[PDB]
Design a protein around this ligand. Structure first.
Ligand SMILES: Nc1ncnc2c1ncn2[C@@H]1O[C@H](COP(=O)(O)OP(=O)(O)O)[C@@H](O)[C@H]1O
Lengths: 561, 37, 450, 450, 145, 152, 145
């Protein structure tokens, strides 16, 4: 009765269990039928268990057994291209026991090692997997395998004369993997999308919330980022799936390609599904399983992106578990415990100096789905308070066919200054000044449109008409990006600034021409404008040539007067 | 000027929509806590 | 084995068993009643007592009244012969014909078969409606909701698709599953007559749930329908189109019992479980293993109080590959079908269009029409602000384009437009715009198609 | 004496003692745990059982598990050497330095010392921020909240005051106590680095509570901070400034446990005791006995959902002597600091201004700027109603004054303005108004200062 | 259905009437069922529900009302009575919103069921246009029928 | 209340064969208001044809609930058994409601909108149902209830 | 009435004060009773009631509050003291709603008893109009008196 127990009663979704004297609070327990449950209530004469599935498969007298884990994950060769679920297992094992991997020794007998040290390399999937000494293990390498082929279970090394090490390791998804230190936001996560990279930057290891109503394009921002962002690995927690969003990804993504290599994107991805038939428990643990896998890859020295479809549904699954445990409901009936937990999750994001030096990072992009436009609790409210970045897909911007549909007035990044130096040193000296100038343009447009909504546009001076003209070019030629175009699907950093300078240079020239009594109507039909409009489709620098083409054309307008 | 009162009128009713009905899912939730307890 | 009622509160009945407790989900039968009264086990309370939910009224029940355990829940009498029949929400005949002769007896929750493949929706379903086929193409395996409101002809559209849909040269046979929930007797008689007269019934299974049928039968209706679709698609290799009207009415019934079940209500009085029950229905769609068949859904989502942000319609959006949103304002302007051209999307549209599917210029034309219609609609506001005469020549063209889009593209005189016909109308109306203003159509397409 | 757990529900644990019951507030220690697990007694249930609240997770607890009574509550290792150290919410080192060497061990609830005098707050605290020092002067012993919302730089302001604050020629030494609650690891690393780099750490005690630290540790954080402040002020005669961010986050944790404690919820889901717990924190401020020292508070109150009427921020207003309210709307207009000039008040402002303190014209200038800015803001509404050109010449001046107030007085390019500098800017902007329209400035001041 | 009568009786009044109505149509008669009104019936039902401590929703009405009201109107129709012969029950229900709001209870739920709506318009009445039926706001989903 | 008192002083049934009477009931009024109402009825001679019931703010809440019922019963008696046209003036119904609402909580009911008793309309109906012509058609009961808007 | 004091003491504080107030008016003095505030007194009373397990109502306040609060304000007045002579107790009570809501406890019940209300207006204050009493929202019942 220490390691196992027997069902006393079941109905109303809680299983009461006699025994399980050594079970931990929040441990997964296993019913004979094969269902799993979570130990929620420990009482003097029973354990109350939340069942992660249908309780009719549970009867009084049924045997229940401990698992000993809040949970764990396997971390070694065989993770890439793999499709798991909330608790890691083929969509059951986790890592192939038969698959052979080419292990390459990166340490000699006599070397002194510490947790995080790299002892070997495995080209499991290009990616090159980095075999590390499990956290909390140090000493002297007394034995190490030679360059050959081995299965996961095999021992490749021994430390301190007997701890045995393999190519994989296990880790509690609930416990954030150790690290020496977390570094300050310094390097931008080059998205390739002009509005993001320019106005609402995400830093490598930053937490930037994606929030807005259903069908605004939240997931799509995430998917484009994975197809084109500068992270080597992606950890997609395709939660809030329904109707067929499961099968929509089941046989679809296995075909999506890596724009960078022309190989399957899954070849550098880990999927974590959260379907409706799955217990609230699994979906709750899914972000923790993902973040742990994410932290694992950054430990190798990779920059990984963690995309969380979504936390609104995770908080609903958690509220279901809490209410079943009879915890006191608060606002919208959510338990009090949620805010600290959600924050703790986002805190595990960041670019670090991994164990044994080297730098890696986990950038988090979380989807926000309020109950319906209310944009309050759970999701939005608590999230927008943590995250440093928010890209507001705007349904009105979408209906107007302005893509990406990111509202340049309601979106924000707290990382703008954090990443500006990376852009200034590696891309362009005028990155920050350019995005500030474009944003002031968009800001001015917003104010002008509010007034025009009242007094009409007929009274507008030429100066104000010019600002709307250029503001419109920014929205159509820059903010809007075509995810479906083979070229504009990804916009390299170098291309983003060059397009910005074409627009900003057209602005200066526009304001300069007006100041010299050039009719705005003359500028509005300037031939270069149509080329500036198709610039996002050009894959060659022929784009910066537009600056000189713009200047001469204005001169031809200074000529005619 | 009857433009003011016009579309801006749509204004007051999405505003008013928003909450004598929202303020009510609520007088009643809290009932509901120890209304249910 | 037999039990005795120990408590009754509305739809919830507690029942104590001295020997053998019935497992959760079992159907129990109350003894001593004129009409069959089923109690579905919901929980084991402890002390040999279970908590249940009644499938019909509990008036006249007494404490101590006897109950038997039937030994099972409830299920679908699966057969290819389901085609050509009209049934209730529970799969009982409504057409005066004999009960189905099952080839297999399938559970209906979605656990049976495990039919779906991990492959993306693809290939064309010709609805015969230009505003779907041309601009918002329905693809095999997709979930493409009709988004409407009270008073609008959403059911006429649903019935028309049921009559017209096909999978143009596919090696696979095509079938329709049409499920109606909480409909009037008049509506039921109309749907029946329509299927029978047109000969649409030959390739369809029809499930009809009436407003006065048990609420539990309404909850089971979409599950009977989806199980039949998955059977035909997986075991017979068919491309099956499932039409479910109205999901909002399904939700009103599910919501109706959540209170009797003891839950704390969520926003707008809804069940706290709204999204994870609704997910059990929208998860059931896509290509089936073998890739000979597929299950496609066209769910109808009426806005309660015309509010697209109500939790029901709002949570349904994620389950779809194409959405067609109908608007009362548009209907009141006499534009039918009353589709909001700036709120209808193809989640999966790009997977069913282009060369070898529709035509190479399809995406460009769709993008340009959407952009021009949205600008034209905003200009209707600007006309109201400044007056018609103060509008620029360029804006006047966009204003006029919005009327042309509504008069000629949206409006169909009932009529099965091929995608070629729909693109032709699209190009014809686009001519109203200055060629210099076609920002979203590459020059290659203008030269070839304009 | 030892007890045994008889029940566990989340953070609430019941514990039965056969001999000697531990009094309410005592810290109990759970035996058999890898990391220290404290249970704080909350109630005596009867039958030798007490009800407690855990300071860390309760996963892995078993009924019958042993518990010892420590004989006291939680406590502060009090010493002047607290200055220069960074600690957790519980006062454990975070700076890799040794644990504090206590001169005294103090209870933290506010019962220790009985430090406060029955004297009014008085004398200047120079924050180095013009919008506080000049217009809403912070006084020694006052509670002057920063009133903000999510997304706004309230923490930047809090950190800047921590770096800059002093008590200009005072015979008494000055110290800062900075407490952060429910912050991210990134924010904690930032705050640490800031205190260490600037040398602000030399005169400060810093308590940092992380989002993932136990909820009970967050509740104890402000009490550790206030006890340290009262010790330094009363036993060492110091003027101490306590900065607490964010009170709303403290409240989210206290609210989180109220449910587990069995209470019927109050409005907005909050604990029914919201105002009498919050009173235990705002009561702890003012001049201390001897009048050599004092405790001043600058609590940060973020509006949840930007709603200043939410019970948390709304109940905090009464605990303050100066309030600085930040507004998202103002921040979105690019006005920083994003202070609402018509919702920021000084309860005790009149006690820290005038001849011999600031300057004789300070009240008149403050009154006139406030009146002109409020009129100017209303006129922004009138401009929207009638149009800019329909505004009178006089109203246009007030409209323009509001922009001048925002551009020149509110906005500081980070910059330590003396009260003389702030009054000068005030008079410079006032010149924009007709002299005949300066209703709130006596003629004596106009002649002398205009 | 007077005010001194329990909410129970007024609640049952439409069911007693419809049953009597169905009884006459069974004979082969066409009967008209005129319901003054359902707004007051839903107020009597809300009183009973609140006294039973059922959870209040919009305007404090119980969740159960929409399905019930619909079930009532569903009993309307022209049928082929037991033993052949045709009869019918036509229902005309009065709608009285709390005051012009025309939301819940009455109107909202009713206008969603009923196939016909004859909108008496106070402005048409003041103008002495009788019957005061607004030919722009009224509808019959029976025109084609 | 000035209007209510003025009607009490002035009301009549112009050439009726039936005698006329007033029943004036005040609920939850101050001592000052009670002294004023008394003085007014006595000075004007309105008291000769009136029955007056006065309930003070500090009188038991149950006595306030019973006040309108004492008043209506007296009116029905005078109208039916004596054939009189009786005018009943009840101020203020909102104050009656504040007392009835005050006990609903102590009675164990789940509150309805705005904190009111769930039974608000079926208790209030017991008072508004009591009016009209009486059998014989010699008398009648008429009501002028005062309804102050809480919070307007 | 500090926060460290039991709900009991703060509850009794208005009664101790009013009694002392009535004592001075008995001498033939006109006394002013200023009550900071009754919102906090009703919160202290709700704490005591909930601990006694009395049924919570609106905002979880006990049913008993309205009659009690009224009984308090009823002890106000100018009287002819025992043995002739005139004295009086005038009450000025502070109102502090949970936050602008201005509903329960404090405001709602109080504004129904009191004859006078002086509405300090934060917008009048921001505008530097002192006293910040809103001459449109304030009222007294004594002008003619
Ligand atoms: N960047 C985009 N470009 C064009 N259409 C888009 C874009 N993002 C979203 N959409 C449209 O919106 C639909 C729903 O987008 P999605 O991201 O899946 O919604 P959600 O916010 O619910 O995750 C897409 O299928 C597409 O039709």
């Amino acid at each position: 009765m220490i390691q196992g127990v027997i069902q006393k009663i079941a109905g109303p979704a809680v299983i009461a269990k006699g025994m399980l004297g050594a079970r931990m609070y929040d441990i997964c327990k296993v019913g004979e039928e094969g269902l799993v449950g979570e130990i929620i209530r420990l009482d003097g004469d029973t354990a109350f268990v939340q069942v992660y599935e249908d309780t009719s498969g549970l009867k009084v007298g049924e045997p229940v057994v401990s698992t000993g884990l809040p949970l764990a994950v396997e971390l070694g060769p065989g993770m890439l291209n793999g499709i798991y679920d909330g608790i890691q297992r083929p969509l059951v094992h986790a890592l192939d026991r038969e698959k052979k991997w080419a292990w390459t020794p990166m340490v000699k007998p006599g070397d002194e090692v510490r947790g995080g040290m790299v002892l070997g390399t495995v080209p499991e999937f290009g990616f090159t997997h980095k075999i590390l000494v499990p956290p909390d293990v140090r000493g002297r390498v007394k034995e190490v395998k030679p360059a050959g082929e081995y299965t996961v279970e095999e021992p490749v090394v021994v430390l301190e004369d007997g701890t045995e090490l393999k190519m994989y390791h296990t880790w509690p998804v609930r416990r954030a993997r150790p690290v020496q230190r977390k570094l300050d936001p310094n390097t931008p996560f080059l998205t390739g999308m002009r509005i993001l990279d320019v106005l609402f930057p995400v830093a490598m290891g930053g937490t930037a919330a994606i929030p807005g109503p259903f069908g605004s394009g939240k997931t799509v921002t995430q998917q484009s980022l994975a197809k084109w962002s500068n992270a080597d690995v992606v950890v997609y927690v395709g939660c809030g799936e329904r109707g067929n969003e499961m099968t929509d990804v089941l046989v679809e993504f296995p075909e999506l390609t890596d724009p960078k290599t022309g190989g399957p994107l899954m070849h550098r991805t880990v999927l974590i599904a959260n379907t409706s038939n799955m217990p609230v428990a699994a979906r709750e643990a899914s972000i923790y399983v993902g973040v742990t896998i994410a932290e694992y890859f950054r430990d190798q020295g990779f920059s990984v992106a963690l995309m969380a479809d979504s936390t609104s549904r995770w908080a609903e699954a958690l509220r279901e578990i809490s209410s079943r445990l009879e915890e006191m409901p608060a606002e919208e009936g959510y338990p009090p415990y949620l805010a600290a937990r959600l924050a703790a999750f986002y805190e595990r994001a960041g670019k670090v100096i991994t164990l044994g030096g080297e730098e890696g990072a986990v950038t988090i992009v979380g989807a926000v789905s309020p109950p319906g436009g209310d944009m309050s609790e759970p999701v939005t409210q608590s999230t927008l308070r943590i995250v440093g970045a928010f890209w507001r897909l705007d349904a009105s911007l979408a209906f107007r066919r302005h893509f990406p549909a990111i509202n340049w007035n309601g979106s924000y990044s707290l990382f703008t200054s954090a990443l500006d130096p990376w852009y200034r040193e590696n891309v362009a000296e005028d990155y920050p000044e350019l995005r500030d100038a474009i944003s002031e343009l968009l800001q001015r447009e917003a104010g002008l449109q509010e007034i025009v909504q009242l007094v009409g546009p007929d009274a507008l001076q030429d100066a104000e008409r010019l600002v709307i003209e250029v503001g419109r070019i920014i929205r159509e030629d820059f903010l809007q990006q075509n995810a479906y175009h083979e070229v504009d699907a990804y916009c390299s950093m170098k291309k983003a600034y060059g397009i910005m300078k074409m627009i900003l240079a057209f602005y200066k020239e526009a304001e300069a021409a007006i100041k010299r009594g050039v009719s705005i109507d003359e500028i509005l039909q300037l031939p270069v404008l149509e080329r500036i409009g198709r610039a996002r489709y050009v894959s060659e620098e022929e784009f910066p040539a537009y600056f000189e083409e713009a200047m001469k054309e204005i001169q031809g307008a200074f000529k005619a007067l | 000027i009857p433009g003011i009162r016009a579309q801006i009128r749509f204004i007051q009713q999405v505003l008013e929509q928003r909450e004598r009905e929202d303020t009510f899912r609520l007088k009643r939730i809290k009932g509901k806590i120890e209304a249910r307890e | 084995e037999y039990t005795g009622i120990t408590y009754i509160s509305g739809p919830l009945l507690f029942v104590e068993n001295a020997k053998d407790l019935a497992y959760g989900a079992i159907v129990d039968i109350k003894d001593g009643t004129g009409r069959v009264r089923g109690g579905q086990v919901i929980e084991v309370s402890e002390e040999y007592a279970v908590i249940q939910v009644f499938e019909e009224t509990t008036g006249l029940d007494l404490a101590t009244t006897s109950v038997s355990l039937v030994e099972d829940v409830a299920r679908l009498g699966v057969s290819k012969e389901m085609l050509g029949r009209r049934f209730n929400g529970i799969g009982k005949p409504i057409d005066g014909l004999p009960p189905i002769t099952p080839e297999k007896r399938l559970p209906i929750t979605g656990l049976p078969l495990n039919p779906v493949a991990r492959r993306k929706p693809e290939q064309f379903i010709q609805t015969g409606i230009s505003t779907i086929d041309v601009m918002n193409t329905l693809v095999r395996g997709q979930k493409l909701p009709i988004f409407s409101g009270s008073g609008l002809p959403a059911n006429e559209i649903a019935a028309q698709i049921a009559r017209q849909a096909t999978v143009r040269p596919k090696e696979e046979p095509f079938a329709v599953v049409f499920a109606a929930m909480g409909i009037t007797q008049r509506e039921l008689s109309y749907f029946i007559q329509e299927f029978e007269r047109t000969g649409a019934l030959s390739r369809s299974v029809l499930f009809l749930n009436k407003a006065d049928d048990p609420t539990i039968e309404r909850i089971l209706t979409p599950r009977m329908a989806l199980t039949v679709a998955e059977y035909l698609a997986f075991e017979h290799d068919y491309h099956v189109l499932v039409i479910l009207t109205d999901m909002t009415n399904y939700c009103e019934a599910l919501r109706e019992i959540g209170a009797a079940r003891e839950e704390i209500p969520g926003r707008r009085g809804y069940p706290g479980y709204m999204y994870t029950d609704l997910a059990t229905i929208y998860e059931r769609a896509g290509v089936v293993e073998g890739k000979k068949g597929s299950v496609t859904q066209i769910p109808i989502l009426s806005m309660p109080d015309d509010d697209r942000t109500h939790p029901i319609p709002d949570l349904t959006g994620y389950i779809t590959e194409g959405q067609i949103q109908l608007s009362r304002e548009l209907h009141r302007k006499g534009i039918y079908p009353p589709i909001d051209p700036l709120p209808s999307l193809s989640r999966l549209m790009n997977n069913g269009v282009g060369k070898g599917k529709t035509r190479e210029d399809h995406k460009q034309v769709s993008d340009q029409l959407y952009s021009a219609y949205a600008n034209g609609v905003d200009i209707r506001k600007l006309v109201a602000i400044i007056g018609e005469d103060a509008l620029t020549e360029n804006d006047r063209r966009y204003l006029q384009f919005a009327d042309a889009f509504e008069r000629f593209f949206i409006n169909q005189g009932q009529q099965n437009r091929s995608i070629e016909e729909s693109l032709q109308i699209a190009w014809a109306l686009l001519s109203m715009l200055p060629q210099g203003e076609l920002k979203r159509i590459s020059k290659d397409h203008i030269g070839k198609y304009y």
